[PDB]
Homo-oligomer: A and B are copies of this chain.
Amino acid sequence: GQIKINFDASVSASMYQSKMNVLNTEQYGRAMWQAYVNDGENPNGNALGYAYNWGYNADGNPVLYGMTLSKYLDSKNTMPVADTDWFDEITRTGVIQQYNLSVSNGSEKGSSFFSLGYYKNLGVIKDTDFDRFSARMNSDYKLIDDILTIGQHFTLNRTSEVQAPGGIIETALDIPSAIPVYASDGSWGGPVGGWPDRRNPRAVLEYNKDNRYTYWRMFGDAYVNLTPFKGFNLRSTFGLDYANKQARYFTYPYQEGTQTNNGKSAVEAKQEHWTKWMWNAIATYQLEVGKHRGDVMIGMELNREDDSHFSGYKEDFSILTPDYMWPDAGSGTAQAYGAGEGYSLVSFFGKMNYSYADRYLLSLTLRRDGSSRFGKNHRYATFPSVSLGWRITQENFMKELTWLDDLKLRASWGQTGNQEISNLARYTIYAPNYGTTDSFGGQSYGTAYDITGSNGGGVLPSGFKRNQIGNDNIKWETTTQTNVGIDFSLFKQSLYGSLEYYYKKATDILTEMAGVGVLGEGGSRWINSGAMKNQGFEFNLGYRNKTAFGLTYDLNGNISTYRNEILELPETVAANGKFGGNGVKSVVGHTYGAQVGYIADGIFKSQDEVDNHATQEGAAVGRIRYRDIDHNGVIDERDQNWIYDPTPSFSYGLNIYLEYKNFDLTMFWQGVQGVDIISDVKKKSDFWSASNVGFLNKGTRLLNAWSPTNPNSDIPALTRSDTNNEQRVSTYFVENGSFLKLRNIQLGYTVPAVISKKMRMDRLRFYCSAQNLLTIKSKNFTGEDPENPNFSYPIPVNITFGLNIGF
């Protein structure tokens, strides 16, 4: 009948634009010397030396005059000295290209659709990539001209990626720049001696580059819709969603500096399989009697997911290439892994819809849902909802205004469930875990022991081990929610918007609860722990017009606000600070995620302020001074109060569309103001010893720590050990996370239809676009991303060129 064709294509370059700055290899020594002399041991007896000619100023203080490092890091000259930018070393400009062609055909009789597309992505991490092919094929048929439709949706995907390893950027930022990339032969460089037991990340990436998965996913449905007469039709649909991931991971042997493997080669070939199917059947009747309108609907839907996975492991390979490293060619020992899980949900439902004329509307809904995840004392759970509005501008007493285009007054109340918890929540789980599986520094937890004292060479006797305690009285998390709002439109639909207010109250919150310590192994269980309150207001306001000199504009902002309150909690649960006041104060009556901690009042600027302040264990000159809230003249542990609050003062957003002379400009600003933010990145940027591993690289800012020669710095001095417990929960780690993000900007040129039609087109538009271009942040923030405080690096900046084609 009518055939539509749409083509789209993009390229997008993608760049990290900022990161936590870390020590130069030059400054890494300045930082150490300063730490050593602050603590009064000879700076020249360091394990990494780094030889200094320092001394004192006529003032008694120490002064650094100069540094020398001896070309190689060892007395054998295997590892030359470098000044590596480990971030720039494992980082690329990312590049994205994608195209998509889609074509639809709608006769009346039926209508089909077809779609191909491709996306490819050079990661911003080196030796990483990702690609995806999609095909979509949808269609329907009218078997009996207004009585039997039959139809199908289908989508087919194939993905292939080499993923970046578990936090490598994090591991690039704390590998001192003194380490080189390459050793002196040309090997992969790496630590030597007492430098930190961190492996070369550029090398990690290479050793990873052949670990690629391949993922296929089929998902769609078929449906019949039968209309037995007038305004009543029934219809079932059936759907599946099958996915499949296969990959091989390679262990290759490495011996870079002190990082050895000693000579381990292995292969793991793993398989994963997810199979979800679903089936509903739905009948609807609707009427229409002059000033009377009604919908009623009734139906049910089954779901069922069964997923499952397994794996084959073999060590020792005579050729170190992915062509040879298949389990068949392995010589050494082997392991086999795999399990599976699943659940099924069943749901029955109905909806009521009624309207008088077009002024007063009413709607009721009722569902009963049941979940595999529960007993059967609590399998099912019924949820009701009622909502009703009043189109006021249809009241005839209103009418006279006439500029007031529309005005409703909505009010809803309903309940909804949550059973999104582990598939084996209710069970006491005992695993036979024999210990066939990697760990770190021990913690097999393996239940297999050489009882005979033979030292092994054989199969040991195995056991069972508890993974979880059950909860055979575990029930749904019901959430009760109550909305009321006012929709408005004005001046010939040029000023549109809304104002609503919500109150959400959740009951029998589902969480997984770490068990008390003396309970021992697998003390965690899934429990319901009480209630939480959430409520606030929303505002939407759009203004779309078009000035005399031909400039279409459409603005549409949003502003929000909400207060959160933890209501009840089991004493144990309030005691152990999970919701959660750090175990020093309960949270009931405060906010989900509120934290109690010590409060840091700058630092001690001479020996007098230390005596003129409570007996503080490790209080010295230059250390952090924590106020006393005892007001008993000692610090101890009762000292603290509430110091962190996650809830923002309000969050806002504003979307800008413009069109002028075929040019086409759009923006989207989001932001939040007045928000507390707590983070650990300072522990790596303000201290030389606020970590558990020695001599890792540190942030750039502790270069400006307090010292004799440099005071009135907020930042404590530099020591070789955390004697003052600086890494206790304090306000040192709470900063201001107010910001204003420019999510997206996109400028477009659309070629005039008068001549885009000359080439058998219709729409022909080019555009340029950026994502996360810029953020506007508080002065009080140490750095990086305010809405991801925990990360030492920001999000990557995209910049895109692209076109659309119309036909």
Contacts and interface: CB of A to CB of B under 8 A. Distances in A.
Interface of A: 1-3, 5, 103, 105, 107-110, 112, 114, 116, 135, 137, 139, 141-144, 150, 152, 154, 156, 216, 218, 222, 242, 244, 246, 269, 271, 273, 310-314, 316, 318, 326-340, 431-432, 434, 436, 448, 456-459, 462, 464, 760, 807
Contacts of A336: 269, 312-314, 327, 330, 334-336
Q: Summarize A's interface: helix, strand, loop or mixed.
A: strand
A330 B339 CA distance: 11
B139 A152 contact: no
B114 A141 contact: yes
Contact of A143 (B103, B141, B329, B432): B103
Contact of A340 (B135, B271, B326, B760): B326
Contact of A110 (B3, B333, B434): B3
Copies in the complex: 2
Given A156-B218, A338-B328, A457 B457 contact: yes
Nearest to A319: B432
A375 to B, nearest CB: 19
Nearest to A317: B432
A114 B329 CA distance: 45
Given A216-B218, A326-B340, A328-B338, 4 more contacts: A1-B107, A114-B152, A116-B222, A137-B154
B112 A139 contact: yes
B269 A246 contact: no
A135 B152 contact: yes
A555 to B, nearest CB: 39
A338 B327 contact: yes
A338 B269 CA distance: 8
Contacts of A105: 107, 109-110, 112, 139, 141
A300 B711 CA distance: 79
Contacts of A456: 457
A432 B319 CA distance: 11
A154 B137 CA distance: 9
Contacts of A310: 269, 271, 312, 326-327
Contacts of A314: 336
Contacts of A139: 105, 112, 114, 137, 139
A682 to B, nearest CB: 41
25 contacts: A103-B141, A107-B107, A114-B150, A137-B139, A137-B154, A144-B760, A244-B244, A246-B271, A246-B273, A310-B312, A310-B326, A312-B313, A312-B336, A313-B336, A314-B336, A326-B338, A327-B339, A330-B432, A330-B434, A331-B432, A331-B459, A332-B459, A456-B457, A457-B457, A457-B458
B107 A436 contact: no
A310 B267 CA distance: 11
A340 B152 CA distance: 36
Contacts of A154: 135, 137, 154, 156
A333 B456 CA distance: 13
A491 to B, nearest CB: 43
Contacts of A269: 271, 310, 312, 336, 338
Contacts of A330: 336, 432, 434
A108 B135 CA distance: 23
Contacts of A141: 3, 103, 105, 112, 114
A342 to B, nearest CB: 11
Contacts of A448: 331
B135 A459 contact: no
A147 to B, nearest CB: 11
Given A269-B336, A338-B327, A137 B116 contact: no
A432 B137 contact: no
Contacts of A328: 337-339, 431-432
Contacts of A318: 432, 464
B334 A334 contact: yes
A88 B141 CA distance: 49
Contacts of A110: 1, 3, 105, 112
A271 B337 CA distance: 13
B108 A143 contact: no
A216 B156 CA distance: 13
Contacts of A313: 312, 334, 336
